[PDB]
Amino acid sequence: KVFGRCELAAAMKRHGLDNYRGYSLGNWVCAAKFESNFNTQATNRNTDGSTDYGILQINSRWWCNDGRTPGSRNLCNIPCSALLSSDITASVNCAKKIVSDGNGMNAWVAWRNRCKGTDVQAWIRGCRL
DSSP, X not given: OBOOHHHHHHHHHHTTOTTBTTBOHHHHHHHHHHHHTTBTTOEEEXXXXXXXXXXXXXXXXXXXXXXXXXXXXXXXXXXXXXXXXXXXXXHHHXXXXXXXXXXXXXXXXXXXXXXXXXXXXGGGTTOOO
């Protein structure tokens, strides 16, 4: 599914990401934008051979099992394919573990390079939340 901007904002807010570990909603929406263009089905291969999945491009090196990532972990205890559903519950659950891991949203390189230090609340402008 390709979410509208405000539609994704609302889903993420329902699922408890608004200010989760101090990261206001607009941070998560901006991350999703640059990670997936809001598309739950987005997949991209990494140079190390792992693959990133779903709306927040969660990687199989640590977080999920895709059956093809040698020497990886599955800390979210899910198949990576669960991260491509139209329902964002698994991506949100997993993101909450990731963002709690020490590095906060810097775990998302696209957040650090595209969202960090910007007026992220622009991403939720005009939305019914």
